[PDB]
Amino acid sequence: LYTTAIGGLVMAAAMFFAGWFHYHKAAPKLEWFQNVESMLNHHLAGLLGLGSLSWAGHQIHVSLPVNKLLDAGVDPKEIPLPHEFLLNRQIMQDLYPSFAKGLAPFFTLQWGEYSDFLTFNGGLNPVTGGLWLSDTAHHHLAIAVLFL
Amino acid sequence: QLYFTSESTLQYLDGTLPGDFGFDPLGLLDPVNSGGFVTPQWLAYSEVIHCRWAMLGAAGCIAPEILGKAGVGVDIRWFETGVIPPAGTYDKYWTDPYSLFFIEVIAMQFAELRRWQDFKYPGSMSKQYFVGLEAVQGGSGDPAYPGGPWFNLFNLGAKSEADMKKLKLNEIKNGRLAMLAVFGYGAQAVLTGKGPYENLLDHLADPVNNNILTNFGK
Amino acid sequence: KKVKIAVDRNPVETSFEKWAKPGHFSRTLSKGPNTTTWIWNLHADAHDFDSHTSDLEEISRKVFSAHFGQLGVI
Amino acid sequence: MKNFTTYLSTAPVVALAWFTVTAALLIEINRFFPDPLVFS
Amino acid sequence: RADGFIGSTTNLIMVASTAAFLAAGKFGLAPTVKRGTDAACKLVDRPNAAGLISNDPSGFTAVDTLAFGALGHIAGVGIVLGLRATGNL
Amino acid sequence: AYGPDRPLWYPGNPAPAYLDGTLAGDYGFDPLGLSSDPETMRWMVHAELQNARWAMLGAAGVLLTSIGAAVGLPFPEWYEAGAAPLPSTVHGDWSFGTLTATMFLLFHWAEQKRIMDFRNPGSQGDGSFFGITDDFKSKENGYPGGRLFDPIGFSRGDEAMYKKYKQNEIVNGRLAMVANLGFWAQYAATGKGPIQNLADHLADPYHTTFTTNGVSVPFY
Amino acid sequence: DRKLWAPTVDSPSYLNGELAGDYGFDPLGLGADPVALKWYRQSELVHARWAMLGVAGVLGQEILRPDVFWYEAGEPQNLPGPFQNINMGGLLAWEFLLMHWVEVRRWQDYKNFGSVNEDPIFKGNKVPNPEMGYPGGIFDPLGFSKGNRKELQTKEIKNGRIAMIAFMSFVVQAQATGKGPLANLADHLSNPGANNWVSNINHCVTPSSVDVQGLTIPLTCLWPGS
Numbered sequence A: 001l002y003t004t005a006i007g008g009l010v011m012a013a014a015m016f017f018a019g020w021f022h023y024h025k026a027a028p029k030l031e032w033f034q035n036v037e038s039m040l041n042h043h044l045a046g047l048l049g050l051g052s053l054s055w056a057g058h059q060i061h062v063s064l065p066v067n068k069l070l071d072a073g074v075d076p077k078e079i080p081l082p083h084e085f086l087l088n089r090q091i092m093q094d095l096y097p098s099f100a101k102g103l104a105p106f107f108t109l110q111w112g113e114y115s116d117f118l119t120f121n122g123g124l125n126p127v128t129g130g131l132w133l134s135d136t137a138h139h140h141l142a143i144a145v146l147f148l
Numbered sequence B: 001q002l003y004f005t006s007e008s009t010l011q012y013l014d015g016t017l018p019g020d021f022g023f024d025p026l027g028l029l030d031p032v033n034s035g036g037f038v039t040p041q042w043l044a045y046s047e048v049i050h051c052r053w054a055m056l057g058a059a060g061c062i063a064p065e066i067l068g069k070a071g072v073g074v075d076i077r078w079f080e081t082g083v084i085p086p087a088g089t090y091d092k093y094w095t096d097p098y099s100l101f102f103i104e105v106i107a108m109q110f111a112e113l114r115r116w117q118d119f120k121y122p123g124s125m126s127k128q129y130f131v132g133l134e135a136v137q138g139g140s141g142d143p144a145y146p147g148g149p150w151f152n153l154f155n156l157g158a159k160s161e162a163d164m165k166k167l168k169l170n171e172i173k174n175g176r177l178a179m180l181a182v183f184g185y186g187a188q189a190v191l192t193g194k195g196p197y198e199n200l201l202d203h204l205a206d207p208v209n210n211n212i213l214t215n216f217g218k
Numbered sequence C: 001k002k003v004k005i006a007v008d009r010n011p012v013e014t015s016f017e018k019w020a021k022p023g024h025f026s027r028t029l030s031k032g033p034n035t036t037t038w039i040w041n042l043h044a045d046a047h048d049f050d051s052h053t054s055d056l057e058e059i060s061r062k063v064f065s066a067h068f069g070q071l072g073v074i
Numbered sequence D: 001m002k003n004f005t006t007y008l009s010t011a012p013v014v015a016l017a018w019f020t021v022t023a024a025l026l027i028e029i030n031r032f033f034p035d036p037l038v039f040s
Numbered sequence E: 001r002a003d004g005f006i007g008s009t010t011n012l013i014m015v016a017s018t019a020a021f022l023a024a025g026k027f028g029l030a031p032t033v034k035r036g037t038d039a040a041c042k043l044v045d046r047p048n049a050a051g052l053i054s055n056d057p058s059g060f061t062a063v064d065t066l067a068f069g070a071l072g073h074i075a076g077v078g079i080v081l082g083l084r085a086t087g088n089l
Numbered sequence F: 001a002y003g004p005d006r007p008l009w010y011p012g013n014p015a016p017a018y019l020d021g022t023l024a025g026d027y028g029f030d031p032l033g034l035s036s037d038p039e040t041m042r043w044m045v046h047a048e049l050q051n052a053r054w055a056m057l058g059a060a061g062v063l064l065t066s067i068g069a070a071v072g073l074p075f076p077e078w079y080e081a082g083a084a085p086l087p088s089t090v091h092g093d094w095s096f097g098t099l100t101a102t103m104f105l106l107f108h109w110a111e112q113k114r115i116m117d118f119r120n121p122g123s124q125g126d127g128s129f130f131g132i133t134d135d136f137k138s139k140e141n142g143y144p145g146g147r148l149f150d151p152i153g154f155s156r157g158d159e160a161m162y163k164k165y166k167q168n169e170i171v172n173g174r175l176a177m178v179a180n181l182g183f184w185a186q187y188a189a190t191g192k193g194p195i196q197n198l199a200d201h202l203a204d205p206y207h208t209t210f211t212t213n214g215v216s217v218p219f220y
Numbered sequence G: 001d002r003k004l005w006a007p008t009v010d011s012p013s014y015l016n017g018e019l020a021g022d023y024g025f026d027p028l029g030l031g032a033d034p035v036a037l038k039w040y041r042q043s044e045l046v047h048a049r050w051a052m053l054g055v056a057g058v059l060g061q062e063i064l065r066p067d068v069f070w071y072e073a074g075e076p077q078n079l080p081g082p083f084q085n086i087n088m089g090g091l092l093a094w095e096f097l098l099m100h101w102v103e104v105r106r107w108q109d110y111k112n113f114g115s116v117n118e119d120p121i122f123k124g125n126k127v128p129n130p131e132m133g134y135p136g137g138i139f140d141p142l143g144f145s146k147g148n149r150k151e152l153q154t155k156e157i158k159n160g161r162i163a164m165i166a167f168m169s170f171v172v173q174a175q176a177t178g179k180g181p182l183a184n185l186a187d188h189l190s191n192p193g194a195n196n197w198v199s200n201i202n203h204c205v206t207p208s209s210v211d212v213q214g215l216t217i218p219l220t221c222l223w224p225g226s
């Protein structure tokens, strides 16, 4: 949380800097602003589509394994830190056996193999009372391809 | 020659710049209504700087292995030096990795701020006293190519403008290949997990069974 | 018709002189206060860029920059 | 700085300062001398 | 494309889809940079603003080799998964 | 300094207009235009000629007492030289409350005269204090020359030596101010006080850096 | 025209060719300021003359007395004759004032050329000091400068530049192998490939510190030891 807070403050300083820079320094001309076809093309794919795909990355690598371990009863201060799921394939493979294959199923169009972190269960998790994190990951993945 | 070029790109691409193949699909080098760091001058200046850095890296991310495996010494892969501590760290360093970074930051400040001040305010590093080096920090009009008794210390070139122009095309091409290589080193490292040299010495063995497609699963 | 980045180098200067002149944005409120209404007016007319000038180039630059700050405070 | 100080003198800024000092003074007074119901 | 799937129905379907869709633009059977369309789905030609310079005899530009093959890739994926879900594959 | 072509802070960047080069140790360094006002310059110059001078004396002490404590000579380190028992006096024993009050009282008198002359030049030189006049005058802002403040007569002597001496004072004072932040920051990270920190760095120079001290670099 | 340091280079103007050994080698433009060129030259000459004496001592001492390692010969016990275990502080005292006089006198010849030329104690006894850094007279007894001193100066600077480079070799190849200048030549000629800088640069062979008569003196290898 502390690291995130610091990052948000850094972003804040970038935003105000950008506002001053794009006003007192590099101020866009009207012809730039009136390219609606470009704005929509970049806000739909680059902003919404990539924004969801980037989240479908976190949800699949950090939120899903951590939440599974938390719901399994594991103490929060004993769960492997997020990065270990990315680097140590064994840990992620144990939680989701489909990481034993790799990205091969995706390119081979055998997406089905990934039916342990991308599912259409529907309903609510019986342990935490909230939508399955697996279903949310699949949603953001789909929503992305659509926007892109 | 021209690669994926368009009439619009040619309007602002007339061949002068070293290594101009008219390849500007998005069109960022268009001078008309430009500013900030997207000004054509800064873009070309950065490309040269990237080429020089990439060429040093491209030759540095494979040399510890090509030499270390041969038995010269060291024998580390570019990710196991301390750049990315989670992926490994070398043990025999005369100082702390962060301590080295502290010196690195101070050194780059006196080397990349002086370089910059010579672009913003051309030939401004030759007036303020700098241990007498200032004289060698004058540079020429072109920001990318300084010159002087230091940067061009062996006056390579100067025998005709044609030789300078060929030596500048050699660099922009030996550097666009090095830039594509550095990206290759990182990408292969992430997927395979091994070093550039071992990745080559594996394609050479069973090429069909040792490629990106097979590396998707293996 | 070409979609390209178009920018004007260093248009507005960065100074506090305008900061010390409340109402510099409106021709009417630049003449200073004579009634206590001006106080409430300089606030009820500070974000109405369209009222400040007729140029749609400036009004847009102001809107685009404003959004930035909003993001910053968010 | 002459014009920055002019801005820091405008009513909204001066009032923000004066009040903050007055508020902090009362807060600090109760912080060291709490529950001041009577002048004793 | 991995694990030497080459030859697999999936490989054949994807290759066929990508090719059938690139030969639907190089052969003027669909909209392309230049020769666009209309409110009645008829190619009424088009002026591109960048003026892409293509060496291809028909004028097929890189923009059009990355815009028809992508359609083939989406079509192939839809067909592969569809037949896969059914008994067809 | 003391020149139109004086060495500057960021070689290349032009110097501020208010910073002409006359002021001692002028290197045209005012990025946030803090001294844009001429009156502000005079006040800021005086303030610097006040913080640096005290800082210089303070640095001389933290170094002399420290050198003593390292050689063995009974000397409490700067950090613990306040809890040290106050010495007695022929008049009586010292009390912390009285000590603070006396220190402020005396300072108020001197500060008043100094600031009053700063606001009204020559105001103190009115023979009001026991007839002392010119000695209470100020040669320059932050330069109260006389036969009580410059006894040897560096200011009254060669101006070139005086000017050179003025540069020495500014540069040394700025260094002392930076040094003082060190003495404090090295203490609030190492907990040892200088001359022990110089001794540790000269015994294992490579493994005794700021990076390896726990507080400086948190992760490392 | 003089032959320059590289077949493609052009001499810096300030290096017109007056100074001996002018091969136009100033890549960092350090000698651009005429005051600095003057000073740096005197430093070159002093460094050369000191290294030529040094490279002769290391080689010579080894040839004659071979038991004492050049690196370890400044130790009081290592000192020969009665000098063995002589108070180093008292020795420093002599080496101090005596060196201070000769150096300061030489420095005043830089500050005011041809000013400190006459014997301060006695009188009349003076040194020609035709060029700064070339006093001659008592300094040139057998009288060889009377000929083409410039040609001799060129040989002197060129020999000195080789020596300066050679003495820093003796220093490194000694803190790596642990053996003297000619012993490292012998080892190479015994097994060339196996006695190279490859099998010797990975070890800093030489004490980390030396206690001299109660004064510990820390020591270091130029390259960080592997």
Ligand code: CLA
Pocket: A016, A017, A018, A019, A020, A023, C012, C013, C014, C015, C016, C017, C018, C019, C025, C061, C062, C063, C065, C066, C068, C069
């Ligand atoms: C940091 C240095 C700086 C300086 C010296 C200036 C100076 C100037 N700016 Mg400017 N600006 C800056 C930064 C700066 N700006 C940044 C970072 C942005 C991006 C947001 C902008 C965006 C901007 C726009 C869009 C405009 C100016 C304009 C101006 C000129 C007159 C208006 C003015 O600023 O008066 C002083 C104004 C204020 C003091 C208002 C402060 C508003 C700030 C941005 C945030 C306040 C929000 C507040 C916290 C909301 C919550 C309140 C609640 C807690 C009660 C003036 C010369 C105007 C102009 O060009 O002249 C016509 C103009 O339209 N600026």
Ligand code: CLA
Pocket: A032, A033, A035, A036, A038, A039, A042, A043, A045, A046, A047, C063, C064, C067, C068, C071
């Ligand atoms: C993939 C391309 C892309 C992306 C991702 C975006 C994204 C965004 N645009 Mg945008 N835009 C684009 C292309 C793109 N744009 C093009 C090509 C044009 C010209 C036709 C425009 C013209 C345009 C205008 C006029 C405006 C936006 C605005 C916005 C923001 C919406 C406000 C918001 O919800 O804040 C949410 C904040 C976030 C989601 C955090 C992300 C913020 C990052 C830093 C923005 C970076 C976008 C930029 C393209 C990246 C390059 C920056 C680099 C040069 C340093 C949003 C973050 C609005 C805005 O500026 O709001 C302040 C707005 O006024 N855009």
Ligand code: CLA
Pocket: A014, A015, A017, A018, A021, A026, A028, B034, B035, B036, B037, B038, B039, C005, C007
């Ligand atoms: C809605 C947000 C937004 C938008 C629409 C723009 C738009 C623009 N900016 Mg800008 N900028 C923004 C935010 C934004 N900026 C912020 C927050 C900062 C502070 C860091 C800056 C700082 C900045 C500078 C210094 C400059 C610009 C410039 C430009 C113009 C050309 C460069 C460009 O963006 O083209 C396309 C993008 C590029 C050419 C390079 C992209 C580099 C980005 C930073 C990499 C990643 C971007 C992406 C959003 C990251 C996604 C997340 C990541 C983990 C994948 C252009 C019109 C340039 C200009 O003024 O032109 C005259 C310029 O000099 N911007």
Ligand code: CLA
Pocket: G005, G015, G019, G020, G021, G022, G023, G024, G025, G026, G029, G030, G031, G032, G037, G039, G040, G041, G043, G044, G047, G160, G161, G162, G164, G165, G166, G168, G169
């Ligand atoms: C401390 C020794 C020393 C000093 C003071 C000088 C001084 C000078 N040399 Mg010189 N030189 C030296 C050693 C030295 N040299 C050696 C050993 C060689 C043999 C390679 C040469 C070969 C040489 C040539 C060919 C020429 C000069 C020239 C000059 C003059 C040019 C002005 C200049 O750039 O000055 C600055 C020089 C210095 C301040 C010397 C200090 C060295 C710098 C600060 C760092 C060097 C570190 C070095 C690489 C370490 C080597 C280690 C290695 C031996 C293992 C100048 C007065 C030019 C000339 O003759 O003009 C009349 C010229 O043509 N020198």
Ligand SMILES: CC1=C[C@H](O)CC(C)(C)[C@H]1/C=C/C(C)=C/C=C/C(C)=C/C=C/C=C(C)/C=C/C=C(C)/C=C/C1=C(C)C[C@H](O)CC1(C)C
Pocket: B023, B024, B025, B026, B027, B028, B050, B051, B053, B054, B056, B057, B058, B059, B060, B061, B078, B081, B083, B179, B180, B182, B183
């Ligand atoms: C033309 C165009 C036009 C249109 O319009 C648009 C567009 C498209 C955008 C454009 C394009 C662009 C591009 C292509 C780009 C690319 C880039 C890159 C890749 C870079 C690299 C880059 C890369 C680089 C620099 C590199 C670097 C590196 C370095 C320094 C170093 C490293 C290393 C080594 C030695 C070894 C050690 O042990 C470690 C380290 C230290 C780690």
Ligand SMILES: CC1=C[C@H](O)CC(C)(C)[C@H]1/C=C/C(C)=C/C=C/C(C)=C/C=C/C=C(C)/C=C/C=C(C)/C=C/C1=C(C)C[C@H](O)CC1(C)C
Pocket: G025, G026, G027, G028, G029, G030, G031, G047, G048, G050, G051, G053, G054, G055, G056, G057, G058, G061, G070, G073, G074, G163, G164, G165, G167, G168
């Ligand atoms: C010119 C130039 C120009 C540009 O600008 C830049 C540049 C390039 C940088 C430059 C260069 C420079 C250089 C090269 C330098 C070098 C130096 C040296 C090496 C010295 C040595 C040096 C060296 C030396 C002195 C030596 C010394 C020694 C001695 C005394 C002695 C010793 C010894 C002996 C006898 C024996 C005994 O038992 C012991 C002892 C005692 C121990």
Ligand SMILES: CC1=C(/C=C/C(C)=C/C=C/C(C)=C/C=C/C=C(C)/C=C/C=C(C)/C=C/C2=C(C)CCCC2(C)C)C(C)(C)CCC1
Pocket: A145, E018, E022, E065, E066, E068, E069, E070, E071, E073, E074, E077
């Ligand atoms: C005959 C001819 C030629 C050839 C050319 C070519 C080679 C073409 C091809 C081209 C191509 C090569 C095409 C393809 C394309 C494709 C692509 C570019 C892809 C895309 C992708 C996308 C669009 C996305 C997808 C997705 C994902 C990723 C996720 C999930 C969902 C989906 C599936 C949707 C040449 C010149 C040689 C010679 C002369 C004539």
